[PDB]
Design an enzyme around this catalytic site. Sequence first.
Site, short mmCIF file in Angstrom:
data_model
loop_
_atom_site.label_atom_id
_atom_site.label_comp_id
_atom_site.label_asym_id
_atom_site.label_seq_id
_atom_site.Cartn_x
_atom_site.Cartn_y
_atom_site.Cartn_z
N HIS A 23 0.83 -1.21 0.00
CA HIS A 23 0.00 0.00 0.00
C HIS A 23 0.87 1.28 0.00
CE1 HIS A 23 -3.73 2.33 1.05
NE2 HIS A 23 -4.32 1.29 0.44
N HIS A 35 -3.51 9.81 2.22
CA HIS A 35 -3.68 8.44 1.72
C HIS A 35 -5.11 8.21 1.19
CE1 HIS A 35 -5.70 7.68 5.72
NE2 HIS A 35 -4.91 8.71 6.04
N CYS A 113 -4.22 3.07 -4.76
CA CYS A 113 -3.56 4.01 -3.84
C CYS A 113 -2.23 4.56 -4.40
CB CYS A 113 -3.42 3.36 -2.45
SG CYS A 113 -2.49 1.80 -2.55
#
Length: 125
Positions: A23, A35, A113
């Site tokens: 991530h 984020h 992401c």
Amino acid sequence: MASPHQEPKPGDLIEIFRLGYEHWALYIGDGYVIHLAPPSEYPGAGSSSVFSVLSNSAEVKRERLEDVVGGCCYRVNNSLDHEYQPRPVEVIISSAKEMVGQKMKYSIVSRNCEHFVTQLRYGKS
């Protein structure tokens, strides 16, 4: 001698190693990161549909690095410096801050992401 561990600075791309997955996040200084929160399959959950189970979504958020990484390992990995020009870091962080509070779609976004934190430097202009 050089430092034994890494330390993040404003504009750094944070690379996070979970159990069996990776991530990413944009570090903004003072221990904070921006984020994307991941979505799910909720409105199509097994044996149900939109009338019997609710929807979900992804959202751009701001939190502390420690709180975001939790028990997961992490590194600084500014790979996009090889891809794009040296953009002004205040505008990358301003883009992160402008993105905070915005939503994105369901499970069907897949790996997203890294694509999100990419667009903060790539789509500066």
